Amino acid sequence: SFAKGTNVLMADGSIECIENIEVGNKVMGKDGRPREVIKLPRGRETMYSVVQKSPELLKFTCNATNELVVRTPRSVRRLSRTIKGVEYFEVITFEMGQKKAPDGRIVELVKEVSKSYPISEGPERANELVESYRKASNKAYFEWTIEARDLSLLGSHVRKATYQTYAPILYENDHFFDYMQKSKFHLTIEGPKVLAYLLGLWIGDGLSDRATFSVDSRDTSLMERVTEYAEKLNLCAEYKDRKEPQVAKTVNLYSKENPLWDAIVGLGFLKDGVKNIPSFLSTDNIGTRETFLAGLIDSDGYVTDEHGIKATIKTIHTSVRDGLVSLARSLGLVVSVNAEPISYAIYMSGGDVLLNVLSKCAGSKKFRPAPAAAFARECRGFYFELQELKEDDYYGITLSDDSDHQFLLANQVVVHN
């Protein structure tokens, strides 16, 4: 059960409160489809504040009896230690085991186990152990649940190795495929794509009062992309070039008012004065999510590949940062923000999920071929901090009995009913 005001995620895409949710309601299941609300667990107790351990942190406050959904890596190593005179073939593993708490109960949780045998007995077994562990599960981790207060029962190693997980938003709206079906009756099946990329393109190095946006001259692929896309909607991308010495070539997009600036406002990529990331986009049709994203990177982001692919973007307007930090997660990317010299930074990563988003970019050093096969948008983990808190009211949302019992908080975090 969760504290008053715990923003939630409805199966339609909307964000109601845990308190305001009524019975017969649908909440967002960690798989796209909905979950039916039936009860409305009320009461009081100690409340625990879960907070991502590391300022765009994933946090949520719950009831001390709340089953946090978590994961813990499997693990097995066969070393060789000597117990004062006798050398054993120790086998350490992470496995399901019990430990009693001070309440009374026997809690079912994960523990680090050790099983040592003297050498001479031949590691023939020390091995068979390691091999049984190794082919017992089809995943490389344990999906399990422990109540908020029982986290302290975890022994060091296992605890730091345990994390909660937020889920991508596999759910797709279309407020975007629509906003367009109100001006044309002859606009390409590429409608959404092209408009998302330009829209993205507008958030990076854009300008607010005209569909004009200071683009780079040095990028002779971005140029084509920009142009070829400018016409895709219905606009020639006149500009400067071969007249106007500098690298940041201002570009103007006309209707050869203009449906571009009509989009920047209708859908609100310019909420009152300063630019802005609309939150409806988070739960909108994926490709538009990735495509819009592509634009923004192509605009003022940069891609580095040192310890894996990862793209950084910059913004000043938090009204955008916060916007991106969620449009990002909505897809499955892993994200973090760092504040520099007024200036914000959004680091994104995720392998294929990020590729799907970068194979749509066009800027010289930002493209990247699309995935090599099919790829799923797995839930992403996040280690955290749990702080014991006074007492207060709380409100659960008990789901059915033939369902998973998990639903998504507003911040994509996967909590248990």
């Binding site: 009831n63 659960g396 008990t398 248990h416």
Partner: peptide
């Protein structure tokens, strides 16, 4: 008695 679900 519960916990956002009850057994």
């Amino acid at each position: 008695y519960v916990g956002s679900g009850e057994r």
